[PDB]
Design an enzyme around this catalytic site. Structure first.
Site, short mmCIF file in Angstrom:
data_model
loop_
_atom_site.label_atom_id
_atom_site.label_comp_id
_atom_site.label_asym_id
_atom_site.label_seq_id
_atom_site.Cartn_x
_atom_site.Cartn_y
_atom_site.Cartn_z
N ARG A 141 -10.19 8.45 -6.04
CA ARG A 141 -10.24 7.69 -4.72
C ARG A 141 -10.14 6.14 -4.85
O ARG A 141 -10.75 5.37 -5.56
CB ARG A 141 -11.77 7.78 -4.23
CG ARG A 141 -12.29 9.01 -3.74
CD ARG A 141 -11.32 9.26 -2.48
NE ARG A 141 -11.74 10.84 -2.01
CZ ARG A 141 -11.02 11.37 -1.16
NH1 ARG A 141 -10.07 11.13 -0.63
NH2 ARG A 141 -11.46 12.56 -0.83
N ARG A 142 -9.03 5.62 -4.09
CA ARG A 142 -8.77 4.21 -4.21
C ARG A 142 -9.91 3.32 -3.81
O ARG A 142 -10.09 2.24 -4.66
CB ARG A 142 -7.74 3.96 -3.37
CG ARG A 142 -6.13 4.69 -3.58
CD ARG A 142 -5.28 3.62 -4.43
NE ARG A 142 -4.01 4.19 -4.46
CZ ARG A 142 -3.00 3.45 -4.00
NH1 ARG A 142 -3.12 2.61 -3.28
NH2 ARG A 142 -1.71 4.17 -3.85
N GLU B 11 7.01 6.31 -7.29
CA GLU B 11 8.15 5.34 -6.83
C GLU B 11 8.88 5.68 -5.57
O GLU B 11 7.86 6.10 -4.65
CB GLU B 11 9.39 5.19 -7.88
CG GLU B 11 8.79 4.85 -9.28
CD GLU B 11 9.82 4.72 -10.51
OE1 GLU B 11 10.90 5.23 -10.46
OE2 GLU B 11 9.59 4.10 -11.27
N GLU C 144 -4.30 17.09 -4.04
CA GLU C 144 -3.93 17.14 -5.28
C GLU C 144 -4.86 18.29 -5.95
O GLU C 144 -4.34 18.87 -7.08
CB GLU C 144 -4.43 15.51 -5.94
CG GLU C 144 -3.26 14.64 -5.58
CD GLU C 144 -3.60 13.16 -5.86
OE1 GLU C 144 -4.84 13.00 -6.02
OE2 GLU C 144 -2.86 12.42 -5.80
N1 LIG Z 1 3.75 4.90 3.53
C1 LIG Z 1 2.51 4.57 2.68
N2 LIG Z 1 2.92 3.90 1.63
C2 LIG Z 1 2.39 3.09 0.91
N3 LIG Z 1 0.95 3.27 1.05
C3 LIG Z 1 0.42 3.82 1.78
C4 LIG Z 1 1.44 4.41 2.87
N4 LIG Z 1 0.56 5.30 4.04
C5 LIG Z 1 -0.76 4.90 3.34
N5 LIG Z 1 -0.91 4.20 2.49
C6 LIG Z 1 -2.07 3.49 1.83
O1 LIG Z 1 -2.16 3.98 0.49
C7 LIG Z 1 -3.51 3.97 0.23
C8 LIG Z 1 -4.21 5.13 -0.44
O2 LIG Z 1 -4.28 6.00 0.77
P1 LIG Z 1 -5.87 7.03 0.91
O3 LIG Z 1 -5.42 7.98 1.83
O4 LIG Z 1 -6.91 6.11 1.27
O5 LIG Z 1 -6.04 7.51 -0.66
P2 LIG Z 1 -7.09 8.14 -1.28
O6 LIG Z 1 -7.91 7.06 -2.16
O7 LIG Z 1 -7.83 8.80 -0.28
O8 LIG Z 1 -6.57 9.24 -2.30
C9 LIG Z 1 -5.90 8.63 -3.49
C10 LIG Z 1 -5.51 9.67 -4.24
O9 LIG Z 1 -4.28 10.15 -3.60
C11 LIG Z 1 -2.94 9.76 -3.97
N6 LIG Z 1 -2.64 8.91 -3.01
C12 LIG Z 1 -2.65 9.06 -1.61
C13 LIG Z 1 -2.17 8.39 -0.46
C14 LIG Z 1 -0.89 7.64 -0.98
C15 LIG Z 1 0.13 7.09 -0.02
C16 LIG Z 1 1.16 6.48 -0.71
N7 LIG Z 1 1.41 6.23 -1.84
C17 LIG Z 1 0.47 6.45 -2.73
O10 LIG Z 1 0.57 6.25 -3.98
C18 LIG Z 1 -0.55 7.33 -2.56
C19 LIG Z 1 -1.48 8.02 -3.44
C20 LIG Z 1 -3.09 9.20 -5.51
O11 LIG Z 1 -2.56 9.95 -6.29
C21 LIG Z 1 -4.78 9.19 -5.62
O12 LIG Z 1 -5.21 10.21 -6.55
C22 LIG Z 1 -4.25 3.46 1.63
O13 LIG Z 1 -4.30 1.99 1.32
C23 LIG Z 1 -3.40 3.87 2.53
O14 LIG Z 1 -3.47 2.97 3.70
#
Ligand SMILES: Nc1ncnc2c1ncn2[C@@H]1O[C@H](COP(=O)(O)OP(=O)(O)OC[C@H]2O[C@@H]([n+]3ccc4cc[nH]c(=O)c4c3)[C@H](O)[C@@H]2O)[C@@H](O)[C@H]1O
Length: 140
Positions: free
Chosen positions: A9-10, A39, A82
């Protein structure tokens, strides 16, 4: 391709997830964590593919880390996605417990309740080297 995928979780497990990554790399493992290795492209497909690629799935269970999985039956939550991928693919799942309380299985969607049946490792702030050595013994 990576030996180890770190799911976390971030908002609560970022630091530990990063600390695990450093240690496992120091011990010769190739590690996938999103902020270092995801990437360009549509992240949903790329993240799922990266879970499928890694033999080992290290799950950082910080406090409350499965809360957003609860009632997420459309599987829109990313940790939920995941975990379901790791379970479906038969990955070597290694839960890391850092202040996490085990929930009752029935509060979780059926497609991820099996994550609770895997032997977990307790993160010890006082004995970190020993925690890392145990993680490495669990990795395949
Ligand atoms: N178009 C976007 N481009 C960049 N960022 C974005 C975008 N849209 C939203 N966000 C922002 O990305 C952050 C994480 O999103 P979030 O749902 O909160 O995450 P969790 O901590 O629930 O779950 C984390 C676990 O899931 C995987 N994860 C989940 C989601 C993402 C999304 C993009 N890239 C990643 O690398 C990524 C990784 C990771 O491998 C972990 O194990 C927040 O700041 C969002 O606004």
């Amino acid at each position: 391709t990576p030996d180890v995928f770190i799911s976390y979780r971030r908002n609560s497990g970022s630091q530990l997830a990063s600390l695990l990554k450093v240690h496992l790399q120091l011990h010769g493992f190739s590690v996938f964590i999103d902020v270092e290795k995801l990437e360009a492209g549509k992240f949903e497909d790329k993240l799922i593919q990266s879970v499928m690629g890694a033999r080992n799935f290290v799950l950082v269970l910080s406090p409350g880390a499965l809360d957003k999985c609860m009632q997420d039956h459309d599987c829109k939550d990313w940790v939920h996605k995941e975990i379901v991928t790791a379970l479906s693919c038969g990955k070597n799942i290694v839960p890391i417990i850092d202040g996490f309380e085990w929930p009752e299985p029935q509060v979780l969607p059926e497609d991820m309740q099996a994550v609770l049946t895997f032997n977990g490792i307790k993160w010890s702030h006082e004995y970190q080297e020993a925690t890392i050595e145990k993680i490495i013994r669990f990795l395949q």
